[PDB]
Structure formats: structure tokens, C-alpha cells
């Protein structure tokens, strides 16, 4: 929904209130989204490097 980025998407157990769309933790980095077509909380994790 216009919020772009890369990473791996997993299932998450967070609980947004009925009007948020996504989340962030500290330094304002997105780490959870709600898919519009299902209204369930996903989870974003950057894919590995080293």
C-alpha cells in the first residue's frame, strides 16, 4: 500500500488497534505491517548478510 521495502515476511502475534496500518520500534524503522486484503499482522526481517 505504497510502503516499500525488502526483507523476509513472517507471521507475527502483535495486536494493532483497529485503525493502525503498520508499526515501528525505535529510530523509526518499520517492523510490522497489516496486509489490506486480509487484515492480519505480518512481520518484516532483513534478509541476512555478513
Amino acid at each position: 500500500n505504497g510502503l516499500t521495502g525488502t526483507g523476509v515476511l513472517t507471521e507475527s502475534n502483535k495486536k494493532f488497534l483497529p485503525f493502525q496500518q503498520f508499526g515501528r520500534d525505535i529510530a523509526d524503522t518499520t517492523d510490522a505491517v497489516r496486509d489490506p486484503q486480509t487484515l492480519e499482522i505480518l512481520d518484516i526481517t532483513p534478509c541476512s548478510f555478513g
Binding site: 516499500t4 525488502t6 525505535i26 529510530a27 523509526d28 524503522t29 532483513p46 555478513g50
Partner: protein, 269 residues
């Protein structure tokens, strides 16, 4: 700086070899940290053990000797200390020595100093009963050893009570470990502000490379990318310099700690 943008990578390619130096500095810092720990703790050649029967003339080292029941093999005071104090291209490497190895070094040092005295710091450890080692240590501050043997029980009780009080003072009163705490806080603050700095506009049209790339043609997209690049390079250099200063300070503290270990633990000062 780039975050997987080929255009950004090519643009940054022509800024010389700043990044090799930037990586070399951090690598040197990490190796220095490992050396610091090594030279502070690895003062002994063998791993001494304390005998099962513990009759040290009435003294009581239970609160300091390791407890085998616990899985960390730590001691009571060490447990109190450990309980009391508490990705965008960033990596954290693990220290070479684990906490169990450090606790084993500490246990070896303390068992050697209980059982042999100062002799294990020079050559091979030589055993001697604890009471007549404290007699030697009284002899080293101008009191005849006489005085020790005629007040042994009183001295042992005073020592035990002092240990109890230090236990209670640590266990109840907080804010006694500000140094390690604010070292951790300073490092966290530095990383936090470095990460937050990526949201700065720096005088460009936006703070995200994808928008600039997909908003307008290359010719001035290059100018905007250049603005972002110079801002982020400035931030990174500032971070690295502050890290080097703090590393020098920590190294000074580590050298002082090594000297204190060598002089006040392996001998009488």
C-alpha cells in the same frame, strides 16, 4: 550509505578509498578489545583448584568461591553483579572468551591466592596454611606476627562481618555500578543517534533514495544523491572518531586494571 542502489554505489566509487580506512579502524578496535581482556585476565599458567575440605583457620570464603550447583559456575557476589546491571549494516561480533572461561580464570586466581599465597606468581605454587600466611602479611605492615595468633578468632569474625556487609550493600542499595552502566549507555546513545541520522534531509528533496530515483531524471538525481552521500559520510566519520576516543579511554582503564591485578592480587602492595 547506499543501501543497495547501484547508482549510489557507482557514485560513491569515485570518492576514493574512504571506506577501507573506515573498516580498518573498527577492526583494529575490536582486536584491541580482545587483547585487553586477554591481558587483564590470563595472568596464570595453570588452572588451580581448591581442595574439598575447606578449613582456612576460621575464615569463610563461601560467598566468593564458585558454586557448582549453578550452571554458570559463578559465585554469589558475581551473580549479584550480573543481575544488578542490565539492522542497517551494523554487526556485533561475540567476544573471543566466554563468560565461563573468564569465571574459570577468576576461580583459578582466587584458589591460587588462597592456597599458595604470592608464590604462584613467581614460579610453581607452594602450599602454606592460611593462618601463617596472614601472619606473613601482618609482618609486612609493621605489626609483629605475634598479634595475629592471639586475636585470630576476633579477626576472623571481623572479616566475616565485613563480607556480610558488602553483600548487603550490593544486594539492597542500587546505583553502585555507574561506570559500567554509563559506558553501556554511551555506546547505545552513539549507535542510536547514528541510526536516527539517516532520516535527515540534508538539504535535498527527500530522505529516501528510491523516491529520488523514481521522481525525476538522472541529471539532477545525481545532485540529490551527492547531497545525501556527503551528509551520511560526515555522520559516519564523526561516529568513528568518537569511537576511537572512547577506545583509547577504555584501554587506559584496562591497563590500570591489569596493573592492579598484578600488584594487589599476586602480592602485597
Amino acid at each position: 550509505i547506499c543501501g543497495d542502489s547501484t547508482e549510489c554505489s557507482n557514485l560513491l566509487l569515485q570518492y576514493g578509498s574512504f571506506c577501507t580506512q573506515l573498516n580498518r579502524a573498527l577492526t583494529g578496535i575490536a582486536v584491541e578489545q580482545d587483547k585487553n581482556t586477554q591481558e587483564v585476565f590470563a595472568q596464570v599458567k595453570q588452572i588451580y583448584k581448591t581442595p574439598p575440605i575447606k578449613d582456612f583457620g576460621g575464615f569463610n570464603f563461601s560467598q566468593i568461591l564458585p558454586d557448582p550447583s549453578k550452571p554458570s559456575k559463578r559465585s554469589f557476589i558475581e551473580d549479584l553483579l550480573f543481575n544488578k546491571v542490565t539492522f542497517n549494516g551494523l554487526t556485533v561480533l561475540p567476544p573471543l572468551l566466554t563468560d565461563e572461561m573468564i569465571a574459570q580464570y577468576t576461580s583459578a586466581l582466587l584458589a591460587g591466592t588462597i592456597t599458595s599465597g604470592w608464590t604462584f606468581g613467581a614460579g610453581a605454587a607452594l602450599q602454606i596454611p592460611f593462618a601463617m600466611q596472614m601472619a606473613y602479611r601482618f609482618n609486612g605492615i609493621g605489626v609483629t606476627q605475634n598479634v595475629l595468633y592471639e586475636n585470630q578468632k576476633l579477626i576472623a569474625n571481623q572479616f566475616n562481618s565485613a563480607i556480610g556487609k558488602i553483600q548487603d550493600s550490593l544486594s539492597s542499595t542500587a546505583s553502585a555500578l555507574g561506570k559500567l552502566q554509563d559506558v553501556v549507555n554511551q555506546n547505545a546513545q552513539a549507535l542510536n543517534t547514528l541510526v536516527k541520522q539517516l532520516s535527515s534531509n540534508f538539504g535535498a528533496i527527500s530522505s529516501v533514495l528510491n523516491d529520488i530515483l523514481s521522481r525525476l531524471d538522472p541529471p539532477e538525481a545525481e545532485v540529490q544523491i551527492d547531497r545525501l552521500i556527503t551528509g551520511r559520510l560526515q555522520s559516519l566519520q564523526t561516529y568513528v572518531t568518537q569511537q576511537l576516543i572512547r577506545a583509547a579511554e577504555i584501554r587506559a582503564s584496562a591497563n590500570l586494571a591489569a596493573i592492579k591485578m598484578s600488584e594487589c592480587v599476586l602480592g602485597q602492595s
